[model samples]
Target chain A: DIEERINLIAQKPTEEILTIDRLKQYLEQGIDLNHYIGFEISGFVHLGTGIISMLKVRDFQKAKVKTTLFLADYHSWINKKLGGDLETIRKVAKGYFAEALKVSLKTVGGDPDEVKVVLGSELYEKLGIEYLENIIKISMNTTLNRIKKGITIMGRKQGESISFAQLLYVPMQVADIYSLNVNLAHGGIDQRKAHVIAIEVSDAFGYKPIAVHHHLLLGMHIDENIRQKLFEDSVIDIKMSKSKPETAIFIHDTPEDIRRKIRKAYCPIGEIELNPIIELVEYVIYPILKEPIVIENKKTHQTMEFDNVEQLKEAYAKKQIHPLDLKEYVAEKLIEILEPARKYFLEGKGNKYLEELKNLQIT
Target chain B: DIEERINLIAQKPTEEILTIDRLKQYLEQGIDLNHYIGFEISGFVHLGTGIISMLKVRDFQKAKVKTTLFLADYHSWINKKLGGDLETIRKVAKGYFAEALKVSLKTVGGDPDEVKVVLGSELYEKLGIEYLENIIKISMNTTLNRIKKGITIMGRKQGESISFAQLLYVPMQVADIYSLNVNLAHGGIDQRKAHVIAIEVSDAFGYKPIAVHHHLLLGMHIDENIRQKLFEDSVIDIKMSKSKPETAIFIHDTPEDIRRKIRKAYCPIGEIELNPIIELVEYVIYPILKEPIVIENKKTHQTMEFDNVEQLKEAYAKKQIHPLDLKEYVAEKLIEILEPARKYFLEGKGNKYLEELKNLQIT
Candidate 1:
């Protein structure tokens, strides 16, 4: 049980894992292993948060490890996202958000019943004085300088805390680790600050949590030629965001609409590094399907296939692939992978969620 | 009603009052009025906070305006004054603190029930989400550079915030004005930073609080000769503080102990600006007793009386009054003034509080 769980948790490539070794250790000790990844429920769910993340959730479920999807409605209240309306925010958090995650999980091979979805308001009510006391303690142990540096986890710049609650953002996130009986914490690389703090102040909580980090995918907006150069300088320095609609590919996008957006996207003549198309193939497409990578010559209707990312990247880097050729191929692959979720969102309860989000101008 | 409340609030001479005009303006509108001055409930009650402040409360009471004596038990937890234990802090805040304030209020000719005594903890529970929300709003309206400068109210340096709670010190103190239904705020001159912030951010809080500052008493630890030279610089800069226990005279000090402490205080022959003895006479003695200021010469067995502060200062500043003679007479006045509180502490309900404080090793 322990070995299988460790392997499943680590199955995905990570930017960093703060002690995958310790996660295995917790499992060996028969600890009540609980894992969580949180979201602010700001707006539309992009591919990284949807298809890529839910796929990983399926791996955890297969290993029999309990996982939780934390809907951070409270944090959304602080970020002033969706116009700071708690009532409307709560409506979207449970309504659209719950349905979106359910469809995304099913698409990635995870069960709807297996993972628990928790609201931030619900968590806070049961938090009690010990949570507040721990928040104070974490704030005491950390400095203004340290807290400022750690706010990167909240998607703010090093010196860009817009409000005092923004300053509280980091400490409260740290308290979440200590407050929950968590043995395994999982999130994207952006969550490193909070998870590192969870490790840094473990003595205060009497429990050290094991952490797993996943890859952060890139934004759709970029120059195809310079993408690898920029990424070589910083990993995911630019990424898919709900705020920049053009730079993100949402799960709810229609296949024809998806191709229309991709038609104008940046894809290089023959280079693969930092290519959004290549990343989808490596991180999202290949993980689920045994389908070969396809590049077509639109004029002649000629095509080619590569069994693995290495073969595909080697061909692209050597100038054998063209921008339009790769773009059309990526457009088709994503459409193929996203078909089930698209159908569900269109025909099911997700149709109502999209309507509600559209009603709030959040689309 | 507002005009009358302003008059009572400003009845005593203050170090500075922020816009007595606006106070009158607010009063002309017939607005609901309230006043408060908060304390951390650390230990023994000194004269300025105990006697002078409560005496001013009587003035507010006379004008039929509402007032509260805010016991800042939350701040005491952050300040680590009573070892950061809320249980012990609560014990002192409700026990010694409540009774001590009652006796002091009665001594100032005010009824205890006239001024509501609210604890900081209680204030926070009733404070609601917007208190934390407005803390963010204030944090947004200002900057880190500004908050650092405003921390002087806590008697801490710009970077001396020992905890995150200390960083919240200025904002929470600012929130206190907004959280309560206050129209008139009062404190010693040290409250300038927070009161200034309250006035500065009035639109954010939707109400501007009129502030009243009373005279700050000086500490007794001084060179007898050099004090006159130093008095020209500033008043409250060298003022009395609980940090220096020997320098302050608590309301419960025995009559002989009061004399012993006062006799050691700096009262130079021809100076009176920031003199501790002169201030005690001006603020605590004159306001309470109708009797004139008396000076006796032990050498000649002759005595003189000064009808007002002007006469006393003129005689003393002209060197017609010797330091020892004035010290002796000032010591007598204080001993006489403090006699009732001392009697209450030793022979009445206050005696029981003294034992409780002793059990906690507070005093």
Candidate 2:
């Protein structure tokens, strides 16, 4: 039964899972299995922080993992996100953040309430002394080398001059995981450095959490050279971010809008490796669908369905599948998946969050 | 009258005064002019932080300048003194620091209670929300270059891997000056870099403070090459540290002990410009002593008294004063001045701090 749970938790599409052996052994021992992920409520709500993140939370929730979504208000203030105003940051957090996630998860058959949203500032106030003590301990155990590696979590270059608070943001993150008693620290591959630092230094605190690093969603590539410079396939990236509206597909984006943008997405012929559309198909569409991937040729009007991502990858590599067919199918699939969330967000319970997302002063 | 006050605050012994024009104009308006200096309290209380610092504070005090001393326990923790243990740091701060400064100041004829002492951590808690905001604001106007320049405040090289807390230390210091509503920031030349940053960025807060810089005393010569590598005289230099007992003369060191250190101090014959012993007489002795500097040549049984540091410098530059006579007079003057503090610390209630200084862990 324990083996079966880890088998299901690490399922079809997450890019990397840390230590299959540890997760199995960890399941056998009687401890509350918990997963944690945090999003800084800094800018707009996009698919990355929306349905994309929601899917992972659902995976952990169904596997009997208690999920905690840290509403990173304190983190946003330090990063000077949303004008560095704490009150405004909190407004966006609970307003757009909570309502958006609720409908996004509901659209995809996830129990959104299963996640306990912990406000970072509130948690710090509640666990006042222990939090300060833990920060001191974490700061002491880590070296500057270890801290530097985690600076990537801020999406900053290594050579940049990050604020001192942002510099310590790495350690604060690890401490957050420890405080929440997170057994499975969850994020995209970008968060791997922070997670690894946590695991490496956890010996000092006498506890270690296994990392669950999902693949990052790729930004739409306007150019080949630009795509190479940007982060490879993650929910978080430079070009298509919450700050810029035109690039990313928000949870509430109309089906007509997304396919229009998808037409310009970077998908070269037979390039299965770093293609954004294929990554979307593998990570997003593949896991959600009961059937195999279906790519229809527009010129020939021929439709093909592969059993899994591997077969699809093999066909794409062999030139049996073209970039146009893949893009059309990927866009259609994303639109279909996002349609319910869009409808819910625009006219239903999440409508208010949609207003907050639109009216929120980001830029 | 206020210009007169500024003149006294930035008096003769202090190395450099920022601007004669600004101080003159700044005094015309009354937004509550004040002065403050911070001490790391990371190591022992030596001549630099003891009598040299006290002389400057007293100068400000007599001129109606309200002064405050930041205890800096929290600052020391970030700098990794005593392994960042707040409990241990506070213990030393209260037990050794307050006691040490009391006797040290009493010896120089200044009342300890005349100035306010703010513990760094206590101030943060009282200003929970806004303190973080101020730090965020300060971080914005600065880059790694500006922040690196403030590394000298911690007596560290810019290239060193200082802690995340240390990176924020500059901003916190500037905020401390701003929070206290200080108009006259006082310290040796070591703190001038930090003050300059505060002045440049005060456009955001709409306030600026005049900076008073004093000369730094040189450390005893361990080796000619090593001594040369450290800070030079009058302003910023790498000599006379509180951490190394042999190089620095502590307020509690006996007359014989100081004489021993003095004999080893770097004082090249005819080099009055950069001589540490000469600086001691200029800043510490000439300011405090009622009589002139008496450098007695042992061979000739000759005695010469210079009314001021300028007079003494002229004789030393002309080689009329040999290095040995200079050492003898500087050591004797220092012993005579420090004897009051040494006696008070050994016999009075201040004896407890002396014990704490002896018992405190450095490495």
Candidate 3:
């Protein structure tokens, strides 16, 4: 009974489990497993935030872990995101941002209704001083130098001249884990520093939650130099960012736009390492498909199918699967996978929020 | 109409007005003036915290400035004061510390009822996210280096590796000014750095409050070496700290204790510049007496009176007033001045709180 649940949570998209023994022990102990992943309510939802993060949420949902999506409105305000306007950030958060995450979940085979969406401000109000106390407790256990290392979690460069409020972002993030009573703290591997901070200070607050970090989706530009630097500098430089809209594919992007962006993407002939197309297939596609991935060679009018990512990787490494065909398959699957989100936002109830965010972004 | 009010507020114990022009402008513009001076809930109320600070509070009350005594329970919690127990800190803050401040005000001729006593936790709760927002806003304008300079306000040395929570103390102190809607921030001169931060960031928040700083009273140790170092190092080394109970005279100290402490104090004959006895006369006794200070020569049995601190300093400099006479006069005046506070605590409702604080101090 527990084996399948563990498998569901520990599968692909979930890259690091931070001691699988603790996770096993937690599951065996029958603890009320609460999974939380916090997202700053900043710009539009790109594939990283909208797709990759929610795919993990779907895994948690299948594993019967109570999943919560934290909309970090105040965090964005502190980080000076969305022009540093709380009103604007909160409006987009409760409306467009919240609805986009739900729709993104639905697109990734997760029940939007089953997942709990909590606003940072509301949770802060509910917890009040208790939340502030936890922040202080975490900060008390943390050093300034240690917290400075956590700057990358906010997509900022190390040693950047950040405001004092920006420094508090790390402590607040660590506190959110204990405040939410989370047993599984999940985020992209970029969030590893903050999660490690949480795990480090967990003994101070007495709730030691296991951290689960998923792989960061790369932007469209991943040449040899960029790929090498990605490993060297970690995930800050080349991760898909909303700031660089041309490099990012949003959840509600038109199929033509997705195709154009993927067409412009750099995928080497047979390199699986640092290949954005391969990452899209491995993380975004196969996780949802749960079936064979089909790549059609248009000139030959034939199809090549693989049941697992290893088989696909083996074929690609042997130069059996061409990069162009792989790119085409990824684009088609992504466009298909994101179809529901586009429909939900463009023509359904999320349209108003989408329009508002569009207007907000222009301003 | 405002001339007398300005004089009352800017008088003795009010060593520095950040800008006299700002004070005149606020008074001339008929701005609704609210004054706040925060205190960390740590040890017993000593001369610097009790007498010198509230003497200005008395002036504020007389000038009709709405004064608030901010019991900084959370600040003490961050500073690890009162054994770093929040419940212990908050308990002492609301009960003993609060009562002591009220009694201290009464001893200095201030209406205890007129001065609003606000616990930090209560103010934080009342303002909720708005308070947290102001803290973030203040922190946004402040730098790490600038905040590091504010460590002295908490009686800590700069460049000392401090916890992240300790660093937040400055931002939170600055936020308290805005959260309380203070038009005039008042404190001992040691708080100047944090006040400067508030003033520097006040432009960002739109409410430009004037800062009034009272003189920090020196402990009973003020020889040439101590006095020179006092100016060289600022107020931290020789200020009347509660941690050094022998060097400080508590408000509720018995007459015998006050006499013994003052007798054991250093006061060089004809040394007006580096004399703790002279400072007590200038900042504490003269501000309350408002008439004349009388010193008796125990040998000749003749009384010498000075109308002002300047006149007393001139006499002491000329050796007309002996160190023994000055010391004896200070002890008598202090014991007399603190009589009401002693009676209030020993024979009134404040005794229980006082006992609780005493018991808490032992552990």
Candidate 4:
């Protein structure tokens, strides 16, 4: 019976799998629906603020799947502002991951009871450098030079003098798929190389290759008006980045801070423009929400549906909406959505040591 | 009291410092002696084998010193003849070390209680490529031109792929001195570079630098007649080797075997010759005898004082002695001198596992 169960669990998925429909198709074909999802909790979890790829991981787990969250304390050597002691990073990561899971569950309307949370050593080791070395050797065995060109992080047109550890980063990310025994992987378009490499490595190792799918999540800097204009013009700029913090709203920021930042954001009418806040609602919030939502202009009392982001921009340009009103509405909506996490953070639920960590005055 | 006694033992020796003596001087001066003696225990020990440096380490122990004896099991990657099993190596090394202590006690006339032997792992970590990277950084601190001159193993020839392991070997050797807290390091002349580098690292780590000395042991292939001739004519040929089995007498050899080998050895008439058997008797055995004696040529019935090697050689070369008769006399004298060692080996007193090891069939 155990052998049958193990065999059932280990079966590979077949289909052009991406979303739930593809996953259901594979399951119907007697493929193992079981898969592993992992997150590197390197820093504070900025809900709806970081990258869209992270949000997609939540959707995958909501369908009765297991997930692993690794507090990559070791990788803080490069990720942190000042690299030294990893104790605080690990503690913070634990709290952040838990909070992020709660937000993910709520977003996907999934039961949190089914999702498993792992912290610190357990998840990291199973998905870290040692696992990566095995996967890289497998990937390098058969892949010709053509595959090398596809790896975005590692495939620089001109080589750079980065550390060997940095060169190993792409492979390490790819290895996570094999390490977790995932049947299908989901990520942003930026991670195409890593996901493809995972398939190649799995095939080389004689394990069933995991199917992969990528979502076209618009950059935080690309406003909905600009996105429509760019789609029309057939030109695409790179996505929004958290590296430039001014272009992004951090989950830790106050409602007042969010409103102020959003008011100053660039969202030019009738022209494709790079404006992070407008794109956040357009690419992420609008696509995921089931019910129709509307944002009202304070002065004119003209309400607009949150369908195409360009409609919101048209209303604002015609003096049918005030930037202050729009900013306030967005901030209130974000606060309403993120209140549970904020309460948890303030209450220090499952993270009583945050005060002690804060006392250490670590940056 | 132990501290004071250890301090007294650690005090610098002021005398004619031989190789072991120089090692002692370095230890007393607070130098970390990183020198290790490695051996391939493929066969039984040879008594006339000059390079059983592991056996000689007991001399250092008499002064409360310790040394590491690497079994070179991993180095079997290069020399496949040596057994690669770590367990076997450990077993042999432990037994050999104890036996060596007993030999030192017998030869140097000291208590065997002071000697301490360590295995390879106790002395060095099995560093991978990451460790090599650190060593490379240290190596780069010195000029390439300087290292080129020091790497005698590479024969000053360019374009050879001197392995990363080989490049790191010098630093690893030097690191052993720092790790072991050795004040004196004893090695053959061939290991001069390693010894020098150890001293350099000792200085870098602010430990006292080790003093170095070399011994001129006669090669087994050199005939006694030729050695005497060389002494007279000031010409030296063939350096002593531990690798040539037929040239050296192993302590593990039976008394009958020892006698047979000695009888066949070349000790020509009345000339200072390059002979290892006569050299062993003259330099190693005769000096420590209780009474001053004479070895007479049975053919000529002429007696000569064995006070020094010179007096004994002159009488034999003038057709006053037969080489066969001389060998027989030398063999008898040698057996008499090595009686205690012969008993020790045969009785298996020092190492109980010797019988077990001897009984093991290689095939």
| Best model per lDDT | 3
* Two-chain DockQ for each candidate model: 0.36, 0.22, 0.80, 0.04
- Model 4 spans with C-alpha error above 4 angstroms: A1-43, A47-66, A75-83, A86-244, A247-249, A256-337, A346-360, B1-52, B66-363
* Among all candidates shown, the one with the greatest DockQ: 3
Q: After superposition, how far is residue A47 of candidate 4 from its true place, in Å?
A: 5.7
lDDT of 3 at B7: 88
- The per-residue C-alpha lDDT of model 2 at residue A185 equals 91
Those runs of model 3 whose alpha carbons end farther than 4 Å from true positions after fitting are: A227-232, A298-302, B227-232, B299-301
* Cα-based lDDT for every prediction: 0.74, 0.75, 0.85, 0.47
Give TM-scores of the second chain, every candidate.
Answer: 0.91, 0.92, 0.95, 0.67
For model 4, state the Cα shift of residue A224 in Å: 20
Model 2 misplaced regions, further than 4 Å: A74-87, A124-151, A157-172, A178-181, A219-247, A262-271, A289-336, A360-363, B83-85, B158-168, B222-237, B263-270, B290-306, B317-332, B360-363
Q: Rank the candidates by DockQ, best first.
A: 3, 1, 2, 4
lDDT of 3 at B68: 93
Model 1 regions more than 4 Å off: A125-131, A159-161, A224-236, A289-326, A359-363, B1-4, B127-130, B159-161, B224-236, B299-302, B358-363
> Model 3, DockQ value?
0.80
Q: If both were scored by DockQ, which would come out higher, candidate 2 or candidate 4?
A: 2
The digit string of per-residue lDDT tens for model 4 on B1-363 reads 334433433322212223445544554666534434544444555442322342344334444455544444333222233354545655655675346544744553544444445554433333332332233323423433444444442122324334322333345454444455555555544446655655554434555535333334554556443433211222233444445656656555566766787776655555555555566555455544535446666656776565555555665556555667667666677666566666676675843555665445244
Candidate 3, residues B1-363: lDDT per residue as tens digits?
588988898897888988889989888878889988998988899889888788889889889889999999888998888788888888888888888888888888888998888988888888788888888888888898898778888888865669998898899899999998898999988888899999999877897889999988988965437434322475336778877887899988889999999998988778766678888998898888887888889778889977789989888788888787788889999998898889888777778888766574656
TM-score for every candidate vs. truth? 0.90, 0.86, 0.96, 0.51
Q: What is the lDDT of residue B216 in candidate 3?
A: 82
Please give, for residues B186-231, the per-residue lDDT of candidate 2 as tens digits: 7878888889988877886887788888877666763455334442
